[model samples]
Target: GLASANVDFAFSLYKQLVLKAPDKNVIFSPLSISTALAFLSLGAHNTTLTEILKGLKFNLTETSEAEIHQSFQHLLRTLNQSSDELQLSMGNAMFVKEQLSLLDRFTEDAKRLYGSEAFATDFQDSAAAKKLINDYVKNGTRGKITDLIKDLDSQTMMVLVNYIFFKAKWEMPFDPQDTHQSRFYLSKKKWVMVPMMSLHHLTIPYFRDEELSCTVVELKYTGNASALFILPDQDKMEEVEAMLLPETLKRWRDSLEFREIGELYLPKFSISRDYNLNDILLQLGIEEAFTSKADLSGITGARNLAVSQVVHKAVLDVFEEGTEASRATAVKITLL
Candidate 1:
């Protein structure tokens, strides 16, 4: 299923990101990225299609392309379902060169399966095109993501955009009055004072994985989703990170049980991160799509098409109220 495949892809990409920047905060949406790439697969051909699916960690021997896209439709439907207490939404938009036209099958499937909307534009005017795409992304993410496209090549014929927005209140929210300045441990020898939110006597899902030397806690949102926070034992960060497989995540999730905690303190923070995922995707087995030997002819009935870059930006805000996170991914296609 695409669901589990995405989990595998998530851990793989996370490992790459951690290797790239070991000490930096990591934030990006696996679903957002997979959705963008999968949507792009609608326009892919030959080995390009296979690489996209295989890079996504999908087992093609067992699942057909139809099944994959249908699963995505189902997955997005589930996530986009209405909730009284939470706002979770995702969408796709396409900006194509005014002179070029898309294939009927590609356009139809994109709209039917991925709910993508298309607009024709003149990319020769890079400034206006960038603003239009960035503005669309900003509005899609409710302004949490702004200025997503800082640059757009005039030769780019198409840019496919996907965005996921999630906002939810904690089922057991921290009282604003309970937030106060406290010392936070960055390392065994380094500490800094920061505003921390505290909760007392809360019954939450908690577990301790002795093998991984990490404690896991689940924070429930007002709706179906919940966040898992893992705290590794001092000086064991690398070991814990090295073991972040789907099985490890499932172990912690299944092993957690409701328990009363005496006190829980979390730092209030907000972060925004961006990445050009060209290299990462290359390492993930999406090779030819980014090269001259690519075959994305299904897009425009020509062999001159290839993916130039995939740009992604994400923002997360964790405070006393709950969490607000938004992410957008863009795949730029250019002519040879």
Candidate 2:
């Protein structure tokens, strides 16, 4: 069942994971996370939404009527009944067709219902693939991520029927004319000239230590969830990342203190990242599912089938007031 409550739990888990691994580029919406979790939780026992949300907290608001309707439409379109044989392996054209249909339907509904401005690229042709990659780079960071993907194989080619849309107002809207080129400190001594968004003073949650300053910003959408961004001082990035252990997160939240800060600056840029999850899947204790001896008895009475690869892509757009992010990832398995 692709219920909204289940989707909410999946998003909660993903949010916790992202908070724990802040350095990693990750995006998870209730739609995407729940859809993937439905497939993963198909055969599992004792996989309740309550079990998944343990030890996780999110800064979520009530879902608006439009958001609820859009989410329901997405879930319904994606989880329709398909051929049992199509569920056995990644080569099934029926499965691909279903995915493409879902993406198209979701994109249309998001724009229509939520007034979301969107861009999607389904790459079945070489020229289209090139254009899609180029467009993403252009909108994301002005071509900084141009060469991240060096090669696109046939398997990769077939899996690009994914759409991403971004919609959010700035927290403190930046004027197009007020934007100025500023140096972004990438490392201790390294910096690059990038367009920076400036705000005079914000009432954000701020904390200070002997070494540096930190603040937290919440990215709210019309949807139920919000993505929280924690930016540490330039010198404290290492300390922040190092102090992100499970216990550390608990402590940080329990002992949070508020203060005032001035002269806050952030980059006016968004980022979209795409990668295969073959390595990550293996690292997550599902290695046997990628081997020939895998079993998917829950999905369709399939045996001796293994997931060959998992392809995933994500887009994240952060402006002043909020963020728009989406991701599409497929787990490819082969039947023996």
Candidate 3:
């Protein structure tokens, strides 16, 4: 119900990343990052709280803070439920320095609203702290993500981590035998040979966005979730990227109809990437929380906390059998 805002935020963030690095593979979890930020809002106050929520594309006049938090709570719970066919899991955890005492209200709210567990840690031991966080993330993501924390700051007082892992078998899996080496266009002048998975005489939900000059196809998984692969017309990628919005996605989804196709080709690819989101978040107008002037007094009942870094890593593997995707985010709040 409240996914529209999250979708908008996702598009905005994607546009920024595309701007930062053109012609690069980008895969991330908007849900993971937004959930961590929403959780951080619990400790924010004054302008810091406002900026975080607003940056998430939430309209305070339309949606109350309680409603936003409650929506995330329900969303997380629903997605975390076990499925027989599809495996999707999401959760959050916080590591707080043993010397820093967190407020009872903040900890209780974090647990009840965000389904997060808090662990007392000694950040002075950067090695142990880094390993503890990375191991926890690796387990949470079923080992798809290891070494999530490459480095740790001894001054870090708290680290809030969130992860989402998903895997599913395609309803109509591609036959590996049919895969062939095919030309994949990088541009009009460049092409690369790739193992392209092929399916013929198949019926799938598909649509062509005339205005956007893109083809949208939905590949269903065995269970509830599916993926929409959008292909922009050659040389129209920038136009399609600029036009990406929740409304555009809704239009394509609603207009999709089951159609039979003679042949369809999809490349089998795997992508894993990590990002430092400090500059991106600052550009998104979330500056107060990242600066010394931040007001996160609700967390420790003191004005000595500010977010130092936000790191995110994601992996997506698409093969003949199915697709597996995992993502993790860490917000390191340091004591100033």
RMSD of each: 1.0, 11.0, 0.9
The models' CA-based lDDT, in order, is 0.92, 0.44, 0.92
Instruction: Show the colliding residue pairs in model 2.
Output: 170-320, 170-321, 171-320, 171-321, 307-333
Q: Which candidate would rank higher by lDDT, 2 or 3?
A: 3
Best by lDDT: 3
Cα lDDT over the full model 1: 0.92
* Per-residue lDDT over 246-293 for candidate 3, one digit per residue giving the tens place of the 0 to 100 score: 988888999999999899999999989889998889888899998889
RMSD of 2: 11.0
TM-score of every candidate? 0.98, 0.55, 0.98
Model 2, 210-322: lDDT tens digits are: 33356555433443333456678777765665554445444445555544546666677777666665554344344555555554433333353345565556666656554
Total clashing pairs in model 1: 0
Candidate 1, after superposition: displacement of residue 213 in Å?
0.8
Instruction: Look at candidate 3 and tell me the lDDT of residue 32.
Output: 95
Off by over 4 Å in 1: none
Q: Candidate 3 at residue 276, lDDT? A: 93
Candidate 2: lDDT over CA atoms? Answer: 0.44
